Amino acid sequence: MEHVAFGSEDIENTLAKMDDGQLDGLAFGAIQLDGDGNILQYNAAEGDITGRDPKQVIGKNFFKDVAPCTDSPEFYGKFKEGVASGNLNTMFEYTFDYQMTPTKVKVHMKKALSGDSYWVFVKRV
Ligand SMILES: *C(=O)/C=C/c1ccc(O)cc1
Numbered sequence: 001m002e003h004v005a006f007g008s009e010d011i012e013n014t015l016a017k018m019d020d021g022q023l024d025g026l027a028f029g030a031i032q033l034d035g036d037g038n039i040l041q042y043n044a045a046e047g048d049i050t051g052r053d054p055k056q057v058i059g060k061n062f063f064k065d066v067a068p069c070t071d072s073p074e075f076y077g078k079f080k081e082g083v084a085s086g087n088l089n090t091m092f093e094y095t096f097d098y099q100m101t102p103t104k105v106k107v108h109m110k111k112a113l114s115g116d117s118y119w120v121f122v123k124r125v
Pocket residue numbers: 029046047050052066067068069070095096097098122
């Protein structure tokens with residue numbers, strides 16, 4: 001076995017129905033979004049490094065109301081491509097340095113199978 005897997009234990013499935021402790025003990029924050037970039041879920045992993053938390057970032061747009069860096073052609077860019085492609089599936093090396101310290105993370109976002117969503121999993125590096 002290797003370290004925590006990015007795709008990990010079928011996140012999307014565990015994020016549509018949640019797991020034991022809402023699978024918040026992962027190493028990659030799992031966030032969802034609804035046709036606009038409105039957070040649907042966030043989990044405690046990423047929210048534990050920055051403190052965002054889901055109940056707090058709930059309603060906050062993860063593109064401009066939570067992270068002002070994801071509103072670019074590399075983060076929201078591949079998101080506007082996956083949303084218009086009908087199968088969001090992209091990743092990229094990003095750095096969360098918003099009002100805080102310099103964070104590094106390998107991102108991996110895909111099209112949630114809940115019916116039509118968009119989740120961005122950030123795996124701290
Ligand atoms: C860009 O500045 C992103 C910042 C960010 C993303 C995710 C988090 O949990 C915290 C900050």
